[PDB]
Design a binder for this molecule. Structure first.
Ligand code: CPS
Ligand code: CPS
Ligand code: CPS
Ligand code: CPS
Ligand code: CPS
Ligand SMILES: Nc1ncnc2c1ncn2[C@@H]1O[C@H](C[Se]C[C@H](N)C(=O)O)[C@@H](O)[C@H]1O
Ligand code: MET
Ligand code: SF4
Ligand code: CL
Ligand code: CL
Length: 346
């Protein structure tokens, strides 16, 4: 019954059958209790601080062709852009002036920058006394090594799906094995490492979602980014169903229960499929928010999926808006870089 699943989650009996049953029960009472449990674990382990990561999406050029993504190379109905190094550095400086304590640099897999222009940008931003997170895709070990020597602190590389068959179908340039090898290299090089997955991919099953949770737990990732699949009209998956908000929220809540000391964002995709979805997610296990800091006129050209919020407002609105959010939630802004603070247990 739901009570018995909750009890097993509370005593840390994280078996495959317990996770499947949590994801399969659709009862409102059960779901609300699950969300309350995750919220309480979050508060006890990571407290009330919500860490702000300012994201600059500096290029929408990509060499890969992932079937879900609006930036895929085969999409000709997109104006491509690249920010200059100076633009990136100065836009980072503006975010630090606005109180950001981590800068995230994200792009398509755009060969132009790689590896040396990224290194040069990283060194300049590190002088500002903030954490730097990279989210640039799959590259050789040597590139990751260079970026770590340049001063990068963290790397986000969602595993997308832990089903190797599904992974290869959706990401035909590469494989799950390659994705995992990148994540293991990043861990070995001393990055704080983020993984995570989409929920509601075409062909993805409940057992696949269980395998995503067990994967995350196995590798003890420092950050876990989860959101729904949202179909993009200029992709092969244009006519597929969007991922379910509630199911995706349950994946966030279980991630917190499994990895109680991790850093878990309330992703912009969650706020795209449901109005107020980030705020809900911050009350169901999440403790990080990533306001968009990409400048106009580029911001509106980086749409992995459609409907992305934060496009019509001034490009400096997002940091103040998340600071208001944090206050109205009865939470506090992060006081330091918000690195992982491990609580060793049994
Ligand atoms: C308690 C009050 C007033 C009821 C009354 O007195 N009239 C009613 C009015 C509108 C209701 C919410 C909405 O329905 C949306 C949503 C549906 C979910 O299913 C359960 C959660 C949620 C947030 C509802 C909770 C609650 O039930 C609300 C606040
Ligand atoms: C805000 C709404 C509706 C509350 C409501 O409107 N309930 C009636 C009035 C109650 N009051 C005490 C204000 C007055 C009672 C006297 S009265 O005379 O009105 O009957 C309630 C109903 C269900 C609640 C969520 C669930 O828990 C799951 C989850 C637990 C986490 O931990 C925090 C996040 C989350 C999503 C919760 C948020 C919020 O909390 C919800 C939406
Ligand atoms: C950038 C400009 C010009 C001056 C400047 O270049 N200022 C650098 C500050 C650098 N820090 C953020 C590291 C200071 C931390 C001080 S603190 O005492 O908060 O630790 C300054 C002048 C007024 C400042 C805003 C207001 O204040 C209100 C508000 C406070 C929140 O809090 C952060 C967000 C917000 C919107 C502020 C953003 C930014 O900052 C503004 C625009
Ligand atoms: C009102 C909107 C639909 C908006 C629309 O019209 N589109 C629907 C879509 C997703 C729904 C929430 C999730 O189910 C998770 C959670 C389950 C709890 O039981 C009650 C609280 C909560 C936060 C739900 C409230 C509400 O019901 C939401 C926001
Ligand atoms: C400038 C805009 C409008 C308003 C809206 C919400 C405001 C923040 C929150 O109040 C929480 C917090 C309270 C502390 O006192 C001072 C710092 C901080 C971060 C506030 C700064 C500023 O005032 C904000 C961003
Ligand atoms: N089509 C679509 N739907 C949702 N999520 C997508 C899609 N394409 C790519 N992605 C995901 O974005 C991450 C990068 Se971080 C995303 C932000 N946190 C956000 O929510 O906007 C990719 O790794 C992929 O999972
Ligand atoms: C824009 S998608 C996120 C960054 C990188 N292209 C990746 O797929 O991991
Ligand atoms: S998900 Fe990342 S690698 Fe794949 S097409 Fe989009 S931008 Fe390129
Ligand atoms: Cl980060
Ligand atoms: Cl993320």
């Amino acid at each position: 019954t739901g009570r018995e699943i909750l009890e097993k989650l509370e005593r840390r009996e994280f078996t495959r059958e317990v996770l499947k049953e949590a994801l399969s029960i659709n009862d409102r009472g059960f779901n609300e209790a699950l969300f309350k449990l995750a919220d309480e674990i979050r508060r006890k382990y990571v407290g009330d601080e919500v860490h702000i990561r300012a994201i600059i999406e500096f290029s929408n050029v990509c060499r890969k062709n992932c079937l879900y993504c609006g930036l895929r190379r085969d999409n000709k109905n997109l104006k491509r852009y690249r920010m200059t190094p100076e633009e990136i550095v100065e836009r980072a400086r503006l975010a630090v002036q606005f109180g950001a304590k981590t800068i995230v640099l994200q792009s398509g897999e755009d060969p132009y920058x790689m590896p040396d222009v990224i290194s040069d940008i990283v060194k300049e931003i590190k002088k500002m006394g903030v954490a730097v997170t990279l989210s640039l895709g799959e590259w050789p070990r040597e590139y990751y090594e260079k970026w770590k020597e340049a001063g990068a602190d963290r790397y986000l590389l969602r595993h997308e799906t832990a089903n190797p068959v599904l992974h290869r179908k959706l990401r035909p340039d590469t494989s799950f094995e390659n994705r995992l090898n990148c994540l293991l290299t990043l861990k070995e090089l001393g990055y704080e490492t983020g993984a995570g997955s989409m929920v509601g991919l075409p062909g993805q099953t409940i057992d696949d979602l269980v395998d995503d949770l067990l994967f995350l737990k196995e590798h003890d990732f420092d950050m876990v980014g989860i959101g729904p699949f949202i179909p993009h009209p200029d992709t092969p998956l244009a006519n597929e169903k969007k991922g379910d908000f509630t199911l995706t929220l349950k994946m966030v809540a279980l991630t917190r229960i499994l990895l109680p000391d991790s850093n878990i964002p309330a992703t912009t995709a969650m706020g795209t499929i449901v109005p107020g979805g980030r705020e809900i997610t911050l009350r169901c296990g999440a403790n990080v928010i990533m306001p968009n800091w990409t400048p106009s006129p580029y911001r509106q050209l980086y749409q992995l999926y459609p409907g992305k919020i934060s496009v019509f407002e001034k490009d400096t609105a997002s940091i103040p808006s998340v600071m208001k959010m944090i206050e109205l939630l009865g939470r506090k802004p992060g006081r330091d870089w918000g690195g992982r603070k491990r609580v060793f247990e049994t």
